[PDB]
Design a binder for this molecule. Structure first.
Ligand SMILES: *C(=N)C1(NC(=O)[C@@H]2C[C@@H](S(=O)(=O)c3ccccc3Cl)CN2C(=O)C2(c3ccc(I)cc3)CC2)CC1
Length: 219
């Protein structure tokens, strides 16, 4: 794998969004992964509808603003035959009746791939596939108030993940001792972290479970 990857540079990543006071992180993780894979396929970056996923993916197992799984989102897109654009089906931050309209479908998927539960496997995926949906343990105040640098939380769990985000690359700081990170896009607005991103500790015993439930859609 390259020593550093940043898919933002290659046009795969939309601007940071804000989930608000709805438990829809999983939807933003899923749209981010599918935005990447559609861009790879078509050369067009089109922002996708989280609201469509929040409102419509109950049959696949998702719980709207009460949580969900990226893999269930990818299954919904496959079962449904499409996913609307953000423009056509804007984000409300509340669960509402399903208003999917196939006329405005701009994405598809044919399934998904679960990555092996090792950081080395995650690195190989990020290097070759594009942005990857991941689960992290985000349940420490250190994460809520994260501002800059490499996030390391001694009490982070590699098993107890509660937040779905998007790995858009990886690299290393030149400053001193433990300087490698995953470049992670959050869905908490641009105000949080580093423009809405968190450079998370990489190759430090699967810190915060970042490699424990990683996946991406096939297109
Ligand atoms: C996002 N605003 C919130 N978190 C969730 O919905 C997270 C997302 C995923 S995950 O990324 O944490 C995860 C965890 C374990 C295995 C795979 C994945 Cl993708 C699930 N979320 C959860 O909080 C839990 C969950 C699991 C399944 C369902 I349906 C609903 C919720 C509790 C694991 C809402 C805060």
């Amino acid at each position: 794998a390259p020593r550093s990857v940043d898919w933002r540079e290659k046009g795969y990543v939309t601007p940071v969004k804000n989930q608000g006071q709805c438990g829809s992180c999983w939807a933003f993780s899923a749209t981010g992964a599918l935005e990447g894979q559609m861009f790879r396929k078509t050369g067009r970056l089109i922002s996708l509808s989280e609201q469509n996923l929040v409102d419509c993916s109950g049959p696949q197992g998702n719980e709207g603003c009460n949580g969900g799984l990226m893999d269930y989102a990818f299954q919904y897109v496959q079962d449904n035959g499409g996913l609307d654009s953000e423009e056509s089906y804007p984000y409300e931050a509340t669960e509402e009746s399903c208003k999917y309209n196939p006329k405005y479908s701009v994405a598809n998927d044919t399934g998904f791939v679960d990555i092996p539960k090792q950081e080395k496997a995650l690195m190989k995926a990020v290097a070759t596939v594009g942005p990857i949906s991941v689960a992290i343990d985000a349940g420490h105040e250190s994460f809520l108030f994260y501002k800059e640098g490499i996030y390391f939380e001694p009490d982070c769990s590699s098993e107890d993940m509660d937040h779905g985000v998007l790995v858009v690359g990886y690299g290393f700081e030149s400053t001193s001792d433990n300087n490698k990170y995953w470049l992670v896009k959050n869905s908490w607005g641009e105000e949080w972290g580093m423009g809405g991103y968190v450079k998370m500790a990489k190759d430090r015993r699967n810190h915060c479970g970042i490699a424990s439930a990683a996946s991406y859609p096939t297109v």
